[PDB]
Write an enzyme that holds these catalytic residues in place. Sequence first.
Site, PDB file in Angstrom:
ATOM      1  N   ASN A 193       7.990 -25.262  -2.105  1.00  0.00           N
ATOM      2  CA  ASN A 193       6.563 -25.090  -1.606  1.00  0.00           C
ATOM      3  C   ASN A 193       6.463 -26.214  -0.766  1.00  0.00           C
ATOM      4  O   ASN A 193       5.709 -26.047   0.457  1.00  0.00           O
ATOM      5  CB  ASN A 193       5.560 -24.842  -2.672  1.00  0.00           C
TER       6      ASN A 193
ATOM      7  N   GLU B  82      -2.989 -15.331  20.408  1.00  0.00           N
ATOM      8  CA  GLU B  82      -1.601 -16.129  21.185  1.00  0.00           C
ATOM      9  C   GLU B  82      -0.623 -16.166  20.511  1.00  0.00           C
ATOM     10  O   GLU B  82       0.577 -15.924  21.097  1.00  0.00           O
ATOM     11  CB  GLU B  82      -2.151 -17.407  21.475  1.00  0.00           C
TER      12      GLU B  82
ATOM     13  N   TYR C 223       9.921 -24.573  -7.729  1.00  0.00           N
ATOM     14  CA  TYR C 223       8.870 -24.177  -6.653  1.00  0.00           C
ATOM     15  C   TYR C 223       8.043 -25.244  -6.024  1.00  0.00           C
ATOM     16  O   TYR C 223       7.816 -25.103  -4.919  1.00  0.00           O
ATOM     17  CB  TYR C 223       7.943 -23.048  -7.641  1.00  0.00           C
TER      18      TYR C 223
HETATM   19  N1  LIG Z   1       8.710 -19.916  -2.584  1.00  0.00           N
HETATM   20  C1  LIG Z   1       8.254 -19.703  -3.621  1.00  0.00           C
HETATM   21  N2  LIG Z   1       8.278 -18.287  -4.141  1.00  0.00           N
HETATM   22  C2  LIG Z   1       7.482 -17.985  -5.185  1.00  0.00           C
HETATM   23  C3  LIG Z   1       6.807 -18.662  -5.752  1.00  0.00           C
HETATM   24  N3  LIG Z   1       6.367 -18.176  -6.932  1.00  0.00           N
HETATM   25  C4  LIG Z   1       6.729 -16.763  -6.754  1.00  0.00           C
HETATM   26  N4  LIG Z   1       7.666 -16.782  -5.951  1.00  0.00           N
HETATM   27  C5  LIG Z   1       8.331 -15.589  -5.623  1.00  0.00           C
HETATM   28  O1  LIG Z   1       7.588 -14.413  -5.667  1.00  0.00           O
HETATM   29  C6  LIG Z   1       8.602 -13.255  -6.237  1.00  0.00           C
HETATM   30  C7  LIG Z   1       7.577 -12.595  -7.447  1.00  0.00           C
HETATM   31  O2  LIG Z   1       6.430 -12.560  -7.152  1.00  0.00           O
HETATM   32  P1  LIG Z   1       5.276 -13.356  -7.630  1.00  0.00           P
HETATM   33  O3  LIG Z   1       4.272 -13.858  -6.417  1.00  0.00           O
HETATM   34  O4  LIG Z   1       5.648 -14.461  -8.598  1.00  0.00           O
HETATM   35  O5  LIG Z   1       4.322 -12.498  -8.463  1.00  0.00           O
HETATM   36  P2  LIG Z   1       2.651 -11.974  -8.370  1.00  0.00           P
HETATM   37  O6  LIG Z   1       2.472 -12.015  -6.856  1.00  0.00           O
HETATM   38  O7  LIG Z   1       1.790 -13.028  -8.940  1.00  0.00           O
HETATM   39  O8  LIG Z   1       2.431 -10.342  -8.781  1.00  0.00           O
HETATM   40  P3  LIG Z   1       2.544 -10.360 -10.410  1.00  0.00           P
HETATM   41  O9  LIG Z   1       3.962  -9.499 -10.641  1.00  0.00           O
HETATM   42  O10 LIG Z   1       1.559  -9.166 -10.839  1.00  0.00           O
HETATM   43  O11 LIG Z   1       2.467 -11.523 -11.036  1.00  0.00           O
HETATM   44  C8  LIG Z   1       9.845 -14.066  -6.756  1.00  0.00           C
HETATM   45  O12 LIG Z   1      10.797 -13.532  -5.878  1.00  0.00           O
HETATM   46  C9  LIG Z   1       9.472 -15.478  -6.280  1.00  0.00           C
HETATM   47  O13 LIG Z   1      10.866 -16.110  -5.887  1.00  0.00           O
HETATM   48  C10 LIG Z   1       6.723 -20.077  -5.469  1.00  0.00           C
HETATM   49  O14 LIG Z   1       5.831 -20.838  -5.885  1.00  0.00           O
HETATM   50  N5  LIG Z   1       7.019 -20.462  -4.222  1.00  0.00           N
END
Ligand SMILES: Nc1nc2c(ncn2[C@@H]2O[C@H](COP(=O)(O)OP(=O)(O)OP(=O)(O)O)[C@@H](O)[C@H]2O)c(=O)[nH]1
EC number: 3.6.5.-
Lengths: 437, 334, 428, 62
Positions: free
Chosen positions: A228, A254, A224
């Site tokens: 990121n 815009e 990640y």
């Molecule tokens: N690019 C990127 N994607 C992420 C990252 N962390 C989680 N994801 C994506 O987010 C998706 C899952 O949602 P999350 O954001 O992890 O979960 P949440 O928003 O905390 O919601 P909860 O299920 O309640 O924990 C997955 O498909 C991951 O690929 C990150 O740090 N970078």
Amino acid sequence: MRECISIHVGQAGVQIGNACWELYCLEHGIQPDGQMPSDKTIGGGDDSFNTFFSETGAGKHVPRAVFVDLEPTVIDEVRTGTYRQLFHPEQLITGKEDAANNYARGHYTIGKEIIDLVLDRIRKLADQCTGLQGFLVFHSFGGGTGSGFTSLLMERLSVDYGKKSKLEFSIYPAPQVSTAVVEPYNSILTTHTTLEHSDCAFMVDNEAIYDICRRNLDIERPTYTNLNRLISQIVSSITASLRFDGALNVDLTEFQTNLVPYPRIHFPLATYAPVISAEKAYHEQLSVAEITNACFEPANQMVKCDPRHGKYMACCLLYRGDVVPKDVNAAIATIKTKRSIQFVDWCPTGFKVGINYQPPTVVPGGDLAKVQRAVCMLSNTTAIAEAWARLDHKFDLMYAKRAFVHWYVGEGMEEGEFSEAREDMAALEKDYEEVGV
Amino acid sequence: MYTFVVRDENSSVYAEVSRLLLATGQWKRLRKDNPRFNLMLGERNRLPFGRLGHEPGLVQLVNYYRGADKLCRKASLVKLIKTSPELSESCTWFPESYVIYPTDEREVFLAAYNRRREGREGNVWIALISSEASELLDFIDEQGQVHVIQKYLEKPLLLEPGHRKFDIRSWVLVDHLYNIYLYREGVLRTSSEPYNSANFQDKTCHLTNHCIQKNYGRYEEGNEMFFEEFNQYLMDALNTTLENSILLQIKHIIRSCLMCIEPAISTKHLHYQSFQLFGFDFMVDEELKVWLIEVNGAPACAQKLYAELCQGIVDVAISSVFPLATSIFIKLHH
Amino acid sequence: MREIVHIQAGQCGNQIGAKFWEVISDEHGIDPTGSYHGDSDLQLERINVYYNEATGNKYVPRAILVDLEPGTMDSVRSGPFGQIFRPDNFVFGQSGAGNNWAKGHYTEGAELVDSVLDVVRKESESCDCLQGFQLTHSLGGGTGSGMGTLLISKIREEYPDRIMNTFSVMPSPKVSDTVVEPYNATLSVHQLVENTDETYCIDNEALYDICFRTLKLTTPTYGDLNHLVSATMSGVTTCLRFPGQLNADLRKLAVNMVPFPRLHFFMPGFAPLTSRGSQQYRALTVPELTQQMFDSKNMMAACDPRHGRYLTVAAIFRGRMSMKEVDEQMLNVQNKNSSYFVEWIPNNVKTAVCDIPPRGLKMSATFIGNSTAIQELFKRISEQFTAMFRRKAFLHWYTGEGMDEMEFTEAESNMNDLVSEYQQYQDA
Amino acid sequence: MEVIELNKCTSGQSFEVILKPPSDPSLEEIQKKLEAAEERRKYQEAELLKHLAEKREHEREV
Ligand SMILES: Nc1nc2c(ncn2[C@@H]2O[C@H](COP(=O)(O)OP(=O)(O)OP(=O)(O)O)[C@@H](O)[C@H]2O)c(=O)[nH]1
Ligand SMILES: Nc1ncnc2c1ncn2[C@@H]1O[C@H](COP(=O)(O)OP(=O)(O)CP(=O)(O)O)[C@@H](O)[C@H]1O
Ligand SMILES: Nc1nc2c(ncn2[C@@H]2O[C@H](COP(=O)(O)OP(=O)(O)O)[C@@H](O)[C@H]2O)c(=O)[nH]1
Ligand SMILES: COc1ccc(CCc2cc(OC)c(OC)c(OC)c2)cc1O
Ligand SMILES: [Ca+2]
Ligand SMILES: [Mg+2]
Ligand SMILES: [Mg+2]
């Protein structure tokens, strides 16, 4: 000067926010403690970077950001990380038990209990604004918080700030780094509920970023943190016009004017070049023509799709580094004769170009090499609908057996919302098909 | 193993192709909706190209080129040749054509039809065949389907004995590398009744399809003359070869058409790869000029050549990407 | 959600339960006195999930030990790690259940259940955010089976929004205490289908065949069987106990593993399979782990995976290995056997890696499969049940405790329904 | 071909190049939907507690 408030929701949004604000601090010369020696107007100002930072009497530059997560693990790493002094404790909001990858749980069960607290903390930053213009919301499609709570927040911001623009940075689910089998469900549900409430949304497919990290950064299994730092470069490119002097994309309105002629079709495709590894011992710097041409290779897009089989509605080129208009137009003339670039008949065939002379900044010890010039292309092409088709098919496959639907009904959601959200997606795909063919 | 799916049941070409793959012992067939495939023999229409190349751990290949329809639709084939600088309007191997809609190029078509009348020269056209324009325009609006108006080749080459007309079909396989492979075996789809210069309603001697004919079978089996015999006839009848008099032009036309669309359809840097088999239909006038009539995106083979051609498709297109454990094709270099 | 409350009931439950606490305590570096003598901070980052922190730097398992018979509980306190348990959490009766489900559920167990619920309430109150419960128990006796399901029903009454996870040992005539075991199991399965979110079906038929056929143990003991259980139990909780990319918890597991509420009976698997004492010197390669964990010989439920289809799969690799190679090996298996995974659930195989290997292994792999082939287990129980019930044999043991024949017919039909529900999705 | 609206400054410059010319619910409605879902949760949990109540009655009867 008109301020912008960034809202980071769930794990994906929070961790991407950290990468972005880290990058912003390096770009503007703001130290981890919030001091900015180059700012000679202490305790205030209306400079371009004040769109993203407010100033304290002690000279601290504080992000106009709120971090929200239904569980405290991720935001705690902000509270204790290298940039802990940057934010004010009230901007980092955590619950104790997350949405368990459940859109309905984030939206209805747990969201309803925390929505008012978040809006009050958001209101705290808005009261510090002389000209608040809107918000940038970062979230995943897949998570229960990223999907469910964001849509609830987006509907409310429309009520409390109906006059303010709302932009999204949305992480599209990919099996390679996915978290849950139900991510297609959460994606369609959140897209349907958020669609009327977003003015412009930049999707980032974790698949595209993953492969770019493997192919160009030579990273076997990207983390990640790898993903990121690359996403934050694209976000910084897209937001540079708000934080620096310039004539193009200076206010959120815009982005809608330049990129979104139709309200529902408000998902511009981002393409970024060049991505170069730090470990690479010998590198030949790429010219304006080479990086601009790279903007039309699918392997560089944030979403894998084929623009040659769609139509364009708008196209912006955002360069950073050693670029002059003469070289851009020479590259464009060459590319136009050699590539399949079809615009719709009711829009002009033309590129809006912005150049920032400062070349992109890279995090010390990161994976991206310093480059002399870089470009981010934002094009609104119907080809991005391929991602909706991919997502909707996976939704259809599970929903035909009503797999996992019981976890959502159990949180107070009616089964009908699944088909309403899906039908809206069916309408969206039909909209793109009209404009596109 | 490798895996593949079959989503076009009516395809005789790829019914044989899938059969051959299974016989290797290294290809397993799956169900239509199973997404974890290496190769897709997809449906003719609305093939879901947007779902390909998104399976981690799978190199995915399909037997169609997205965008190839612009070459394989009569209306779009005309538009492509008129609008592409690489082809030009002075394109010397495509008959004068005009797009006409049932309700567009109708004012453009009739203005050139006057030049054919004021010059008083050959003025026959095809859409059915007529010598008067407004005769078949009454039949174009009669169907409500976009038709193409094309000048008909009044002076075709006629084989003897028989004084017959024919069309040449060529099979061209384009692989993922966009190499252009011409199958060395062509087919003449011949007419069995003699060509009448003034029997336009008599469609059996004017339209040379294998269905219309089926005097059928009189001169050669199934109204099909292959290249061994046609080359010999040209040697004896005209003192020339198939290569010199006709085949050079055919390879030029195939190369020109497929080069024109290459930037639009190439899968060189795509996340999925494409190959496709094409059928080019050519006409030969009496001065040994080759004309392009149409390009078929979903071609059927001739019965005698199915075995050899389908083995070639597996050879150069499929195993080129998924290896295992003379060539019948002529590489059209570029 | 961080804290898990552990409950072990009856003889089987307490013995595998004690073995579990021995194993994960070693992995988290806690000694029998409750002191941490480990070295890596990863051992402590999520130690709170299973341990309460006590005065003087002592870690106390969040475990409640329950039996109607005082016997096995004395074996625990005198066992290797028996000192670590909180003494007030020992809740025992005097008479025992006599392999009688009715006595555990309706007469003898009902007398003791309230005293267990008081200990549950006391542990829950110390929880920052209780995520759920896990129970260890057999289905063939009377206490873990009959009283165990009574507790589960009671806990759902008092904690209806918390996750209920069980490790349920299935009776087998190859390891058989009594002829009434199919009655107790069928009555318990009826309860488990309604009142648990996740049940790991640990089949004594599979544990024996693994010891006999694979491990070459001609006459295996419960000690040999429980070695397999504690390794599996350690594996399936790895993601709950260690810091990972996933940050997994019981609710996310249920959401992603269970597409239909009743079909929540998982088939666990382990690789490599090893017998006690006899150590391993040759580490397995990633391709070897993947092939073994999906092999029926490594399944802890005596079901042939090729007789059904996987709805969902969760696999946890432990050790220092190429995470790229694990991805390529998992993708390899699903792509070469796609017919055994349902095509209507995209991306239904999830993989995690943990750096910390278990004791005695350098590379290990635990398999959690929600397969429709699990019906073979329920059909096995149902055939033995019907063989006796058609003659009402041995039923007086239960009608004497107040049960009616009707209650047996209902449990029979619900388990048959569960059986036919699994078949519905095997062909779909 | 045509370059227009070119603006310059110390940070950089922007312009536009043309190659060819052309041819919300209220607060009340939200709060009502959020609480309709909570009612659906209360009913489902009430049905559970009623079913568990019937089971306790049966336990007394046995
Ligand atoms: N690019 C990127 N994607 C992420 C990252 N962390 C989680 N994801 C994506 O987010 C998706 C899952 O949602 P999350 O954001 O992890 O979960 P949440 O928003 O905390 O919601 P909860 O299920 O309640 O924990 C997955 O498909 C991951 O690929 C990150 O740090 N970078
Ligand atoms: N301009 C022209 N001049 C002379 N003959 C022509 C002609 N256009 C078409 N024909 C004749 O009409 C026949 C059918 O034409 P066309 O190729 O459009 O039909 P079709 O598309 O059904 C054949 P296929 O089976 O390859 O698809 C050809 O065999 C050709 O001989
Ligand atoms: N794997 C395993 N199974 C056991 C053990 N002890 C008992 N069993 C099984 O559990 C059933 C007997 O239940 P038991 O636990 O003795 O009844 P309880 O004490 O009243 O809960 C039999 O089918 C045994 O095969 C054990 O230590 N390990
Ligand atoms: C397709 O199925 C899925 C299954 C499980 C998850 C997440 C939860 C989760 C995964 C684990 O990895 C194996 C795990 O380890 C056992 C775990 O234990 C608590 C929990 C996602 C899915 O997409
Ligand atoms: Ca200032
Ligand atoms: Mg989260
Ligand atoms: Mg016993």
